[PDB]
Amino acid sequence: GLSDGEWQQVLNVWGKVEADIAGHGQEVLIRLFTGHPETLEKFDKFKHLKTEAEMKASEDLKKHGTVVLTALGGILKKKGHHEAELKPLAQSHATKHKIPIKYLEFISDAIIHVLHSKHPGDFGADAQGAMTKALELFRNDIAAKYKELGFQ
Template structure:
């Protein structure tokens, strides 16, 4: 993975980091709207109607966790095993989140960040896709270590 991809993402990532609750909420609402089957993977949110998603404090809080963790991973510039391994363990063993869902949310993240952040141009979007592809692949390796079968 090229350090240039991380640098390209981080160059436009400031607004995301400054408002991770807002971006995180937007990501989860978009995820649940565009991929309603994914909502079932979140026990706290699985019974919410589409109208109850936006403005939900729990979704905003969880979205903040997602985007804050992603920011921390990106700042590691590929040296993210120490952060990623416990995340993989909890998502594989406790939450039972299929790997494909990380690919799905990755694309949602790219779309939402591009829509909300005009500085996040096509090059930054492409770099984020490459970064997220590596993160998801590495997450999958940790899933394998835990014997997670889908």
């Protein structure tokens, strides 16, 4: 649950992402894959990537980064009223991709890391607080659907 002022911070930060969605999406996935190499094994189309240089050179990884952040941005713009947008993603990630909630924690922290890396000194403590709360809400509502499905 976020206040109006917190949502305003989230959507202000998101403007930074929308200026370069592919570059942000690429770096988020690279941070996930290099920090948590077990996550790469869930992607049949990226498991061939052995080095970060190959990851950086992969145009399909940048494409998928655009898909991921476009979906997340659509959810964030609903300011919590995201049941219709979130349900299909919860279902596909639990039942088809088999993504444990832990990996959603990993990618949430990766987003925070990338924002500081690309905007050092321009991602203030209030903005980090609000973005963190928004990603916690996203993860918590996914977790509720995971529990319904019995997925661990």
